[PDB]
Ligand binder design. Structure first.
Ligand SMILES: O=C1C[C@H](NC(=O)c2cc([N+](=O)[O-])ccc2C(=O)O)C(=O)N1
Ligand SMILES: [Zn+2]
Length: 110
């Protein structure tokens, strides 16, 4: 389609380019996963094969992982430090991917 308006995801706080609709990844059959952390925070997580503009913090941990076989690291916006989701590694098919918090991204035109 000409002039699409739902093609790129940016950080909601600062506008840093983060990912693309084209890179949505249907993990376990769905790109959306509704999950909670040990602090009880509920997230609507969209899985992406690739992302950019993030900064991954700390060492990978398997503890409390929402995706079996994957270890996670916190993914912050590399520009503003907003916590945008997690990077997953150490699994299979794919080895790595990103789980990003949908409401912390803004979707818009390329
Ligand atoms: O796959 C995953 C990722 C997620 N991780 C977290 O939410 C998390 C866990 C801890 N911690 O001390 O273990 C501290 C901070 C956070 C945070 O990201 O705020 C989770 O629980 N399962
Ligand atoms: Zn940001």
């Amino acid at each position: 389609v000409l002039a699409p308006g739902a093609s790129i995801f940016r950080c909601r706080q600062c506008g840093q380019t983060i990912s693309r609709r084209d890179w949505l990844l249907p993990m376990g059959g769905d790109h959306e996963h509704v999950v909670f952390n040990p602090a009880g925070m509920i997230f609507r997580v969209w899985c992406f094969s690739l992302a950019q503009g993030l900064r991954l913090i700390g060492a990978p941990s398997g503890e409390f992982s929402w995706f079996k076989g994957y270890d996670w690291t916190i993914a912050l916006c590399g520009q503003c430090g907003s916590h945008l989701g997690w990077h997953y590694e150490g699994g299979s098919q794919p080895q790595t991917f990103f789980g990003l918090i949908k409401d912390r991204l803004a979707e818009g035109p390329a």
